């Protein structure tokens, strides 16, 4: 630790005092000679001719070599210990705008393909998960997501968003309760498995709940005969082969602040089917004709990629 | 073992196994047994959708892909997730309905533009499908026939009105 | 090992003898020149002008570089081997006032929050336990607590106290029998699971036995109707929301040595309910009125944090 | 990363400018003195006599030692991290004529005894497989053979051949479908277990299918009474005790291009039983008498090792 | 590998040739100056005054630093790789008088307390066995004892003795068959579990067979009523509380070569009960009176430790 610095100054005092009172040189010269001898620069312009001084250099050289080996001994121990700890997690996140993911599955792998790698930290405990996370370019933190103490290691207090996807709904509910105990304003996205636990996640404090098993079950039972709505879901929400559901905000000005939806006539002018308007953390599906657009509103619609561009320029001032 | 379950001569077969490899193998075996049976499979990885389609699956569902795309897009806004969760999972207010067109009921030979379905029933017409093919957002130069299926979103009070409107 | 030191002196003899009998310099100069050449200080005031001496320096330099690389080869091997061993335990405890914990559970995690980290050594064998111990700030020793040979690795002979909490009561009894075979005076604290094994731990040599499963079972069966005593236990022994059970010793003097419990009137003067007195490794619950306090006695009572201070100053001389 | 190079040039500018404007030496001398001071060569022919210059050397030496320790700090971190990654796979194959083996079993061990070690890369995921591969002299790549992303890590696009042998036929079929999605021309050799899946491997795109379980089952049921054909298979295809099945190509010229099989009379002249001819990725078992040899044809036959040599020289021009 | 040596000589040629043809010094001086510049000794008695030579030193110094860093890069990679391999076995035994132990159990731990640590190599494959072996002071080799290839890694061909104790008798028989295929003269000691497999181990080639389960089963069924013979076995063969069974050879001379057992009267003179005589790899239990001792014979007897000494001096010439 700090004992190395004390040892370095100890040998400096011994070299400077001995050379000063043996060769009769000045203090500014003895200090200069000590630094050019320990560093082994060796200018040789102030060599000690006295045989007693020669033995003083021999013991000074021995101490110089010893202080070099202890410096390497401490440096090697610090680096080996730090790399072993960092390899298996056991570290504290220092970022302040990262995204924390609790658990690891195929859905969490899908969302990494649309986000940065160094910005995402994965909090898990299994040994096999660590190798999968590393191959994806993300960061791995070793801990228990249901433990409040381990939730502070990932630094969820200053996190941009938290995504919870664990093995069971019991662990998902417990993880959300622990996050709300630390930070009451962070955004939480959670995945549900059973239909009965959808309301339990909202009571825990989840901002958005996604239930992929419920959606898949209903589509299976309704695709036995015709299954036309399963084609719409697969080709728009999953594959985006020809259509895509997008949400574009209304900027300041936007040439249409105040006009009604009927007057705008978005579908005929652009070609995008309007689903709803996002007025302040709520969705108004199929808004009435007397709805007037405002600033900062979000329009949800479905359209071709060459028609969405026709809409963004249409709402741009 | 697939012959013990009597997969030959059935309404449909639903395949949902622990991995995509087992699903592909099961679909291949079913196609070996019966060639005309309807198969509904579930995909886990995005890269295996085309593999399932080539194996012989008639309908492929990928909930993991949908969940991952909604997770990454809900960080900032998350309004699409609200729509999906309210119209496909919970069906709290609206739900997607597919109502077939019966024979000779007020709609044989009428175009989309003069049908005015949305302004008289309130159901948003997502698309119309005929012959295992879905036409999303049909153009006004389209004619309704007997047997066509209309895919739309509306309240239960509006679905009944639409069904009455499409009745003879 | 020690072959490095022999090699270092071997090259010193070769350099000093060759320079002495070739350049004609004195022994005190040849020894000085050898040390300023191997260390690569290079004053240059005694350079060998003879071409034969120049070749003698070339072979001396080659040996100097070789001895430097073998020194680094041995240092690196020693550090890498030591860090790999220490990472997975495999070390002997050298402390003499530490606390040894056998096994790992939630109860042992609770007692670490009231003790030092570097003072506690955990003796376990599972791989997952090692990571939990490290995150708590304690030290991990790899061994079998039921093995007497591994009990000496943790140095239980000179331990301040030993806490035993294993997976089964069979292992807890076996561990206590092994500790009493090494040291017959060390203090042992053990946790029991079954009610029938409470006496078996005392016969093995356990000084204090704690049975949390028996206490929890009786409270569950008596809390079906009213459960008022469960509120007392939870609010005093577990949470300490408003009350706390404390034990304060009687120092020398203490202004009350010799007075009776009736004369003291602790409850009215202070406000702490007196439960018993700890007279020499025994508890006298509800002492009689004819009980006279002595020096070194311990009073067990329940009171508010602002009333316990009123009692400590009342018994302080 | 690249911050080390910037730091090295930073201290060079400080040393050169200070010595130039303090000791009055030329720029070509200050640059020469800076390089002979940081490297600690120390010629000593331009020592600074000015006491202010001596303090300038002291701070220059301190920066020289600091830049040396940061260079070792970065070198050690790079080497330790790289060795830890390479030890457990997590690397990308850069070869372009290697052989990729998916899975590990006894059959894949048999084919390694007839191939090079550094030319073969094994793609697996189990921890115990890695040690077996290393003892065989091959290379280990950590990944999932059924994952297309991990199939590109092994670089199957530019592979000489791919051998697939996994735990189940479901995984074998899935692996072949993933290889054909990357490269449509690479040669795939796969092993089947069930007889019903032999055609499924060919539809997936396997060039050669081997079914050892089907061959062994038929031999077991036909060896109950006599089992003479099992002796032929074991002594020719497995052990090669006295016979061996070989295929020799027909080179350009070959003294027999155009002659019929009847005219050649291979069996009487040489002593090798002729089984078939490999005319362009097909096998003609027992060719008719009107078959004329061509250039590049392959003859499949059974004969003693001293008779195969009699055949190769017989077909050599 | 060997590319480092080529690089070291490459920079030597560049430094020597440039200094020779620029400063006009002799070849023996240019070679001397090159070695005192790369090693950074820096005598400074042949500094290049020419400015062109100064730039030649700058590029020579840069190459000197580069060759030093590549030497450290190769040394570090060699040491880190070797230590990682040696830590988890993966090494070949080079000893020629060691003892090889196949498998690990409590019986094999008992025999290590009477043998050297560095002389014993344990051949196993489990991960938990490696830590137990290291704590006992023995050496661990990673391999499969039933594999002939792994039996040559432990070097059983030149082994003093081999001890086989595996999980099942099927593996014990298979291991012995593999040892006899390598070396037909090495001594094999094997432990049997089932009584029916005692003869199977002898047919495999085991020199000595020990069956602890059979001995324990018979003692259990005969100790229900009295069990006096179990006391004899426990107090003589296991604990040696007061008696001990010993075998002492007859040296050359021995003052009794040729006398009969009746004439010797060992029991009355010494006090040791004579059980048998080991005449050439056979045991004659209760020898007849007409038995005459020879040279090299071994006497098996039971006696107190103070009576065995009375026998060794009685048979010593
Ligand atoms: C120039 C050539 C010099 C080479 C000397 C090398 C000395 C160091 C040799 C290697 C040091 C080493 O192996 O590390 C440990 C000692 O801790 C350490 O750092 C102890 C470092 C102290 C060494 C002090 C250096 C003065 C030598 C001055 C010589 C004059 C020039 C191990 O402990 P020990 O080795 O017991 O093995 C126990 C088994
Ligand atoms: C100044 C620049 C000098 C660089 C020389 C570097 C020499 C050492 C090179 C690296 C040494 C190394 O790789 O370590 C082992 C040898 O053990 C060792 O320590 C052996 C160390 C002996 C080296 C002796 C140094 C004299 C060189 C004097 C030159 C004149 C200046 C490996 O074994 P080998 O390398 O077989 O790889 C087997 C695969
Ligand atoms: C000649 C003899 C000199 C020996 C000085 C050795 C200094 C380095 C000592 C060891 C450096 C070390 O341990 O590595 C880390 C610091 O990062 C580093 O590289 C920091 C390296 C900066 C050191 C700068 C060297 C200037 C010394 C100039 C002296 C004049 C000659 C650890 O961090 P710290 O140590 O806080 O432990 C935290 C627990
Ligand atoms: C005296 C002070 C000098 C310090 C220079 C230190 C140079 C070496 C810096 C550290 C070298 C290092 O990090 O190792 C690798 C390069 O391989 C290596 O060995 C490459 C070694 C070549 C360095 C050649 C040294 C000439 C410098 C002459 C300066 C004049 C004095 C990594 O690769 P790179 O770093 O790309 O990181 C990729 C991420
Ligand atoms: C080749 C060889 C060389 C070496 C030298 N050094 C110096 C350093 C000092 C600092 C303090 C080392 C020495 C040690 C003792 C012997 C290094 C250098 C490198 C470059 C800079
Ligand atoms: K130096
Ligand atoms: K120097």
HEC secondary structure over chain A: CCHHHHHHHHHHHHHHHHHHHHHCCCHHHHHHHHHHHHCCCCCCCCCCCCHHHHHHHHHHHHHHHHHHHHHHHHHHHHHHHHHHHHHCCCCCCCCCCCEEEECCCHHHHHHHCCCCCCCEEEEECCHHHHHHHHHHCCEEEECCCCCHHHHHHCCCCCCCEEEECCCCHHHHHHHHHHHHHHCCCCCEEEECCCHHHHHHHHHHCCCEEECHHHHHHHHHHHCCCCCHHHHHHHHHHHCCCCCEEEEEECCCCCCCCCCEHHHHCHHHHCCCEEEEECCCCCCEECCCCCCECCCCCEEEEEECHHHHHHHHCCCCC
DSSP H or E segment with residue E101: strand E99-102
Q: What are the distances in angstroms from CA D120 to CA D90, D125, D191, D206, E1?
A: 16, 16, 18, 20, 22
DSSP state of C292: B
The pair of structure tokens assigned to D251 is 């080179």
User: Which protein residue has the closest C-alpha to ligand 5 atom 15?
Assistant: C39
Nearest to D163 by CA among D99, D90, D237: D99
Binary contact (D39, E44; C-beta < 8 A): no
The neighbouring-strand residues paired with A276 are A285, A300
The neighbouring-strand residues paired with D124 are D142
Helices (H) and strands (E) counted in chain D, each on its own, are 13, 10
Helix, strand or coil, per DSSP, at residue E188: strand
Q: Pairing between strand B149-154 and B95-100?
A: antiparallel
- Beta carbons within 8 Å of D158's beta carbon, 6+ residues apart: D95, D96, D97
What is the spatial order of strands in the sheet that D273-277 belongs to? D244-249, D298-303, D273-277, D284-285
DSSP H or E segment with residue C34: helix C27-38
Nearest to B136 by CA among A300, A301, A218: A301
What CA–CA distance (Å, rounded) separates D155 from A14?
A: 62
- C26–chain A nearest CA distance, Å: 11
Binary contact (A32, D54; C-beta < 8 A): yes
Burial pattern E15-28, b for ≥16 Cβ within 10 A else e, equals bbebbbeebebeee
DSSP H or E segment with residue B120: helix B117-121
Q: What are the distances in angstroms from CA D165 to CA B27, D95, D109, E298?
A: 22, 22, 11, 60
Neighbours of chain E (3+ CB pairs under 8 A): A, C, D
The pair of structure tokens assigned to A16 is 């400077």
Q: Pairing between strand C188-191 and C161-164?
A: parallel
* Interface of chain D toward chain A, CB-CB under 8 angstroms: 37, 40, 42, 44, 47, 51, 54-55, 57-58, 61, 64-65, 69, 72-73, 76-77, 80-81, 84, 88, 90, 142-143
Binary contact (E80, D83; C-beta < 8 A): yes
CB A315 within 8 A of CB A255: yes
Q: What are the distances in angstroms from CA A304 to CA A241, A315, B125, D22, D241?
A: 10, 17, 17, 72, 71
Nearest to E19 by CA among E38, E41, E6, E5: E38
CB C143 within 8 A of CB C125: yes
The dihedrals phi and psi of E24, each to the nearest 5 degrees, come to: 75, 15
CB C152 within 8 A of CB C178: no
CB A250 within 8 A of CB A294: yes
The dihedrals phi and psi of A16, each to the nearest 5 degrees, come to: -70, -45
> Is B116 exposed, middle or buried, given 0-12, 13-18 or 19+ CB atoms closer than 10 A?
exposed
Whole-number Å distance, alpha carbon A71 to ligand 3 midpoint, is 7
What CA–CA distance (Å, rounded) separates B33 from C48?
A: 96
Structure-token match 């449909």, residue found: B12
Q: What are the distances in angstroms from CA C86 to CA A81, A154, C257, D197?
A: 10, 27, 53, 52
DSSP state of D259: -
Give the angle C1-C6-C11 at the CA atoms, nearest 5°. Answer: 135
CB D120 within 8 A of CB D112: yes
Binary contact (A215, B63; C-beta < 8 A): yes
Whole-number Å distance, alpha carbon D54 to ligand 3 midpoint, is 23
What CA–CA distance (Å, rounded) separates D292 from D277?
A: 10
What CA–CA distance (Å, rounded) separates A53 from A18?
A: 8
The dihedrals phi and psi of B109, each to the nearest 5 degrees, come to: 100, 5
CB E163 within 8 A of CB E189: yes
Q: What is the DSSP string of E4-25?
A: HHHHHHHHHHHHHHHHHHHH--
Ligand 5 atom nearest residue E38's Cα: 1
User: Which protein residue has the closest C-alpha to ligand 2 atom 11?
Assistant: E75
Please list every residue in chain B whose beta carbon sits closer than 8 Å to the beta carbon of residue D171: 21
The pair of structure tokens assigned to C203 is 């016969």
Give the angle D19-D22-D24 at the CA atoms, nearest 5°. Answer: 85
DSSP state of C237: I
Answer left, alpha or beta for residue B128, where phi above 0 means left and psi between -120 and 50 means alpha: beta
Helix, strand or coil, per DSSP, at residue C233: helix
Instruction: List, as own/partner pairs, every contact residues C269-274 make where C-beta atoms lie below 8 angstroms and the sequence separation is at least 24, other chains included.
Output: C269/C314, C270/C303, C270/C307, C270/C310, C270/C311, C270/C314, C271/C303, C271/C304, C271/C307, C271/C310, C272/C301, C272/C302, C272/C303, C272/C307, C272/C308, C272/C310, C272/C311, C273/C301, C273/C302, C273/C303, C274/C299, C274/C300, C274/C301
Resolution for the entry shown, Å? 2.9
Helix, strand or coil, per DSSP, at residue C130: helix
The pair of structure tokens assigned to A11 is 């040998």
Answer left, alpha or beta for residue A141, where phi above 0 means left and psi between -120 and 50 means alpha: beta
How many Cα atoms are found within 13 Å in the side-chain-facing hemisphere of A268? 7
DSSP state of C195: G
Q: State if residue D62 touches ligand 3 by the CB under 6 angstroms criterion.
A: yes
What CA–CA distance (Å, rounded) separates D76 from A79?
A: 8
Q: What are the distances in angstroms from CA E274 to CA E185, E263, E302?
A: 31, 14, 7
Instruction: Please give the biggest Cα pair distance in chain B.
Output: 55
* Interface of chain D toward chain B, CB-CB under 8 angstroms: 146, 148, 168-171, 173-174, 177-178, 196, 200
Residue from A44, A46, A80, A127 whose CB has the most chain E CBs within 10 Å, to mutate = A44
C-alpha dihedral over B140, B143, B144, B150, to 10 degrees? -30
CB B86 within 8 A of CB B79: no
What CA–CA distance (Å, rounded) separates D296 from D249?
A: 6
Instruction: List, as own/partner pairs, every contact residues D89-93 make where C-beta atoms lie below 8 angstroms and the sequence separation is at least 24, other chains included.
Output: D89/D130, D89/D140, D89/D141, D89/D142, D89/D143, D90/A131, D90/A134, D90/A135, D90/D142, D91/D141, D92/D153, D92/D155, D93/D121, D93/D139, D93/D141, D93/D153, D93/D154, D93/D155
The dihedrals phi and psi of A142, each to the nearest 5 degrees, come to: -90, 120
What CA–CA distance (Å, rounded) separates A248 from A297?
A: 8
In angstroms, how far is the first alpha carbon of chain E from the final one?
62
Instruction: Out of B74, B93, B124, name the one closest to residue A208 (CB).
Output: B74
The pair of structure tokens assigned to E164 is 């086989």
Answer left, alpha or beta for residue D225, where phi above 0 means left and psi between -120 and 50 means alpha: alpha
DSSP H or E segment with residue E30: helix E27-38
The neighbouring-strand residues paired with D142 are D124
What is the spatial order of strands in the sheet that B59-61 belongs to? B13-15, B39-42, B59-61
How many Cα atoms are found within 13 Å in the side-chain-facing hemisphere of E65? 15
Helix, strand or coil, per DSSP, at residue D137: coil
The pair of structure tokens assigned to C175 is 């561990």
> Is C159 exposed, middle or buried, given 0-12, 13-18 or 19+ CB atoms closer than 10 A?
buried
What CA–CA distance (Å, rounded) separates D140 from B82?
A: 47
> Is A40 exposed, middle or buried, given 0-12, 13-18 or 19+ CB atoms closer than 10 A?
buried
Helix, strand or coil, per DSSP, at residue D209: strand
What CA–CA distance (Å, rounded) separates E110 from E114?
A: 8
What CA–CA distance (Å, rounded) separates C161 from C98?
A: 7
How many CB atoms sit inside 10 A of residue A102's CB? 29
């Amino acid at each position: 630790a700090t004992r190395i610095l004390l040892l370095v100054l100890a040998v400096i005092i011994y070299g400077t005092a001995g050379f000063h009172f043996i060769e009769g040189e000045s203090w500014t010269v003895s200090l200069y000679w000590t630094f050019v001898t320990i560093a082994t620069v060796g200018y040789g312009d102030y060599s000690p001719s006295t045989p007693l001084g020669m033995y003083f250099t021999v013991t000074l050289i021995v101490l110089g070599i010893g202080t070099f080996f202890v410096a390497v001994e401490r440096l090697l121990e610090f680096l080996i210990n730090r790399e072993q700890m960092k390899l298996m997690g056991l570290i504290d996140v220092a970022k302040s705008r990262h995204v924390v993911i609790c658990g690891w599955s195929e859905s969490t792998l899908e969302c990494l393909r649309e986000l940065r790698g160094s910005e995402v930290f994965v909090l898990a405990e299994d040994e096999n998960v660590r190798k999968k996370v590393l191959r994806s370019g993300a960061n791995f933190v070793h801990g228990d997501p249901t433990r409040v103490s381990d939730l502070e290691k990932a630094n969820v207090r200053g996190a941009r968003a938290v995504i919870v996807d664990l093995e069971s709904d019991s662990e998902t509910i417990h993880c959300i309760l622990g996050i709300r105990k630390i930070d009451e304003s962070v955004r939480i996205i959670a995945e549900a498995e059973r239909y009965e636990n959808i309301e339990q996640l909202r009571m825990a404090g989840a901002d958005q709940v996604i239930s992929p098993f419920v959606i898949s079950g209903r589509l299976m039972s309704r695709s036995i005969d015709d299954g036309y709505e399963a084609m719409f879901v697969q080709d728009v929400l999953a594959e985006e082969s020809t259509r895509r559901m997008v949400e574009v905000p209304i900027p300041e000005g936007s040439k249409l602040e105040g006009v009604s939806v009927l007057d705008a006539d978005i579908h005929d002018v652009t070609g995008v089917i309007i689903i709803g308007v996002g007025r302040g953390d709520e969705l108004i599906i199929d808004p009435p004709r007397d709805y007037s657009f405002r600033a900062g509103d979000i329009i949800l619609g479905i359209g071709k990629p060459e028609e969405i561009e026709r809409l963004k320029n249409y709402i741009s001032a």
